[PDB]
């Protein structure tokens, strides 16, 4: 119409007219960037939409279907007109939204929400696999032997015209298995979280549809935010009825968003993206990373730096067919039952890309061994959480007073980084590439004197094998420090109403994702003399089987340092920093005779 033509014109005079990011708008070029990677999932801003023209907030809910259609039509008519080069591969488009100032929890949406604009979240549960449906209606005539032809399709409705090449005849027909258009499919079953329940009763759930563009992203137990829209199967068998219609409700997804989203993710500011390389190459940045660990503690540089390096360190370095070495480490702090340790862990999660929360006393380490049937409706399936979170983290707290039948069980995945099961209808296997939280508790009351460590907490012989970042919150009283930190504490309790967390998140996404460091011969013989310094100074006193894993953890520190620099190679610096930290620690966990490598390394130092 005069006005009903102006919808597409508003989109056209939007996507190259409303401009921000200091000129050269996204939707001038963001669409180009969609065509580049061959995605066909352009996404729109409702914020920016209202910043241009508020009008299409009320012109949506009367039929958001037709709004979305009349948009993606514009995307085609622009793309293939200026990118006719595109017109081979897919040549079909639909668009998305990611700005809705609302979260509807479940148990919140009712008959008023019918077939219009929606948002909600939840948790995934078991659902279907990967299937397609149809997309176009065409059959085959047999009275005249012709084709009925292709016919305009309604969402779940018949057409059956008389018009066809068979003298517009041949009411009967048959159908082929080709020359017709297809469309992937997958389903979901959404549950609500165990935090935002009505505090103690059974939860609610409804189902949700995802479509051909949208599959193989979800999984059981994943984090999520979706617009979706409210559905209605228009008849779940109306007749002489129950005391109630047997109706149901679904949501169909337009734009799904993961709320973990552990990939390389963010867009680029036009200039505020070299935020890295205005600063990231300075020499003082060895220690500026420490200032953003956990802004909580006055002391404790050591564990600060250890977690700081090990949050993004890692190298696969798969040699020929032998094995896959490590994207792994097990730093451990066996401190005091009540020095603040369990708080150290949380900021890790609140920055780092993956996780799950688990505390000590988990399962029997089996996990919630199924045989695969369509009896019991599929006999639900998983094996742990390092199966569920690989190349990331999933959390432990207060371990050391747990079932020995778990300390057994986890004792391969750390290092072989491999799972392998049996004891079902299956013996398949699966990948566990992870690292490990620590968070345990000592025995003997609080913490021992410098008297030996094997006496401090009593774990069995074939678990002793691996070990790492050995720190400990040994305590003795300084009143000056008590004054300093307590000022800091009350100051911390006085905030009523160098690095921000705003950025370094992305630095480490970038750092452990893209750059892939190395090593070269510089001084790798010195390592042997220091290993000998272990074996000669430490034989039966302290040297508690610290075999050929922690040594290689030496390399892990060095590679960790250079990725903290985005260096990819190094001189004596990084390795010597590893030697500095290890030299400190293994003096830490001795006897009152505490200075063995100390005396041994003033020449090294």
């Amino acid at each position: 119409l005069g006005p009903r033509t102006e919808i597409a014109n508003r989109f056209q005079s939007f996507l190259r007219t409303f401009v921000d990011e200091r000129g050269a708008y996204t939707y001038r070029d963001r669409i180009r960037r969609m065509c580049e990677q061959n995605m066909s999932s352009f996404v729109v801003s409702y914020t920016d939409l209202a910043n241009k023209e508020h009008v299409l907030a009320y012109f949506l809910p009367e039929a958001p279907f037709q709004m979305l259609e009349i948009f993606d039509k514009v995307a085609k008519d622009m793309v293939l007109s200026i990118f006719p080069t595109y017109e081979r591969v897919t040549t079909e488009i639909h668009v998305r939204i990611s700005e809705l100032p609302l979260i509807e929890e479940l148990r919140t949406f009712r008959k008023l929400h019918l077939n219009q604009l929606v948002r909600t979240l939840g948790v995934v549960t078991a659902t279907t696999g990967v299937l397609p449906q149809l997309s176009v209606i065409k059959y085959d005539c047999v009275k005249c032997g012709y084709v009925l032809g292709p016919f305009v399709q309604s969402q779940n409705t018949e057409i059956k015209p008389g018009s066809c090449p068979e003298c517009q005849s041949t009411g009967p027909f048959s159908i082929n298995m080709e020359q017709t258009l297809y469309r992937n499919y997958q389903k979901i079953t959404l549950q609500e979280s165990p935090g935002r329940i009505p505090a103690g009763r059974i939860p609610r759930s409804k189902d949700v549809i995802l479509l051909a563009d949208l599959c193989d992203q979800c999984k059981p137990g994943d984090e999520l935010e979706v617009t979706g829209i409210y559905t209605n199967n228009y008849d779940g068998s109306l007749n002489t009825d129950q005391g109630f219609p047997v109706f149901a409700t679904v949501i169909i997804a337009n734009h799904v968003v993961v709320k973990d989203s552990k990939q390389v993710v963010q867009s680029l500011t036009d200039e505020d993206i070299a935020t890295i390389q205005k600063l990231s190459k300075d020499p003082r940045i060895v220690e500026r990373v420490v200032a953003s660990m956990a802004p909580s503690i006055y002391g404790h540089d050591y564990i600060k730096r250890a977690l700081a390096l090990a949050l993004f360190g890692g190298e696969s370095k798969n040699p020929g067919e032998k094995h896959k070495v490590r994207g792994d480490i097990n730093l451990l702090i066996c401190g005091d039952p009540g020095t603040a340790k369990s708080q150290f862990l949380k900021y890790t999660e609140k920055v780092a890309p993956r996780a799950v929360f688990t505390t000590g006393q988990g399962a029997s380490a089996v996990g919630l061994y199924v045989r695969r049937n369509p009896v019991s409706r599929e006999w639900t399936l998983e094996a742990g959480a390092l199966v569920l979170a690989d190349q990331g983290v999933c959390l432990i707290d207060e371990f050391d007073k747990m079932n020995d039948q778990d300390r057994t069980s986890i004792h391969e995945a750390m290092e072989q980084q491999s799972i392998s099961i049996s004891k079902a209808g299956i013996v398949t296997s699966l990948q566990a590439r992870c690292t490990v939280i620590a968070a345990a508790n000592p025995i003997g009351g609080r913490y021992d004197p410098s008297m030996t460590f094997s006496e401090n907490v009593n774990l069995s012989e074939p678990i002793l094998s691996r070990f790492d970042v050995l720190c400990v919150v040994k305590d003795e009283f300084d009143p000056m420090q008590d004054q300093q930190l307590a000022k800091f504490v009350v100051h911390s309790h006085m905030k009523h109403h160098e690095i921000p967390q705003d950025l370094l998140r992305q630095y480490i996404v970038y750092a452990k994702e893209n750059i892939r460091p190395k090593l070269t011969n510089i001084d790798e013989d010195k390592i042997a003399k220091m290993y000998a310094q272990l074996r000669q100074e430490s034989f039966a006193t302290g040297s508690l089987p610290i075999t050929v894993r922690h040594i290689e953890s030496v390399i892990r520190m060095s590679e960790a340092h250079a990725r903290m620099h985005l260096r990819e190679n190094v001189m004596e610096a990084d390795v010597s920093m590893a030697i500095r930290m290890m030299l400190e620690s293994f003096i830490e966990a001795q006897k009152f005779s505490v200075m063995k490598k100390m005396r041994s390394t003033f020449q090294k130092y």
Partner: protein, 476 residues
Amino acid sequence: QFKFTNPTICRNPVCSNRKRFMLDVEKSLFLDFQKIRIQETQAELPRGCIPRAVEIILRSELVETVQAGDRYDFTGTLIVVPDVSVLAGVGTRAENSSRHKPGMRELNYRMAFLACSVQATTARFGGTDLPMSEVTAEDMKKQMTDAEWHKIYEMSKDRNLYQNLISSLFPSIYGNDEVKRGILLQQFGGVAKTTTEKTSLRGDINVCIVGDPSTAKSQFLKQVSDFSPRAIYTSGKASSAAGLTAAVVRDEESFDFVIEAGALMLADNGICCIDEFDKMDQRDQVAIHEAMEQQTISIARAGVRATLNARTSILAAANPINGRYDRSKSLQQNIQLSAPIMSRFDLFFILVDECNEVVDYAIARKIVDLHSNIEESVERAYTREEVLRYVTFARQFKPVISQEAGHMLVENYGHLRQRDTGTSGRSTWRITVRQLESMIRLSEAMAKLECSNRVLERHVKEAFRLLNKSIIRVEQ
């Protein structure tokens, strides 16, 4: 109609009378209900037959306000139920065999019931903008949130109301006068800061009772379930570890594994205290070892991304080894328990028993006004209505610290650890920053008593006094 029939004959034309148009879900008439079941009256509990159950339905506005454990008042809309099929109804069957001149469905109807009114009584509390028995229709922040300022100012102004209120809820009780002033601070608010994305900051505080036998440490709390909202009590062995957890299932009802709630766990912003903390098994014990401090907890073996959370404080019920406080062993051997929880609990207040005749006869002199059925209790200072309303108001204030004792809580705490620099030679003890955290919110709440913001160094000094009380009380 309930019995639904797409088939309609015609309106304007002579046209199809079984061939229908398509459907309208767009501009037409829709609505909502749910469906639940109901058991026999617990006010009408006869012998013999079962709890005959009724079917029940709810219209729009009635919805999601029914709930387990609740009694109601319905409509009386008993039904002819447009049912579709059933067995065993082998009575006579009929249908209209029309006029002879020159579709079928078996008929056996069942019963259900419908209702369009609810007063879910015995489940109704109301916060503070509800006008109570005693009110003062005045202007305020909200409707009735403190519109009895006309008195609550007075109940927030006296230097006597501290002790009067300490004595305005123990009329039928007599013992020490330290828990009689400390225990309310458990029910009284904490800190409530407005601050950063560092981590959840807590308002509540751990609280304990120990004492010799038959001291009515139970009767302190037997009433508390009747007292506070959200804060209903039972024991820990009053259920299983389906108190903390739910009842662990291994049979198929909906998806064959269900542990998603508990009994401790549904006490959100009320306390559900427990008795008998000494002989209970070490399962919920190590659960509480972090569930009180790090109120963000998980499980495995059946987890739908298990992340649960405690919310309130606690009340303890210890008793010694021999039943008596025979000073023949250290406290660590007197109770035979662990360290960190003896530090996690920043407040002890043990109730010790003796034998002096005047005391016991004075108790019986309490009893003089326990069965004098007119005047079977002692005088008071402040009625309950105004009391709880002042309590319900005194939170909404944003407590604050800018005080030199806030600056020099460093001083009092430096002295706290100066005098506690020892506590290491004769039966060593441990100091820890949970003590500081607890003193902080303690001082803060002690000024929240004032119906005022902005901490004062009086509160620090009394808090220091009370911490000194507790720690020297820990002395053997």
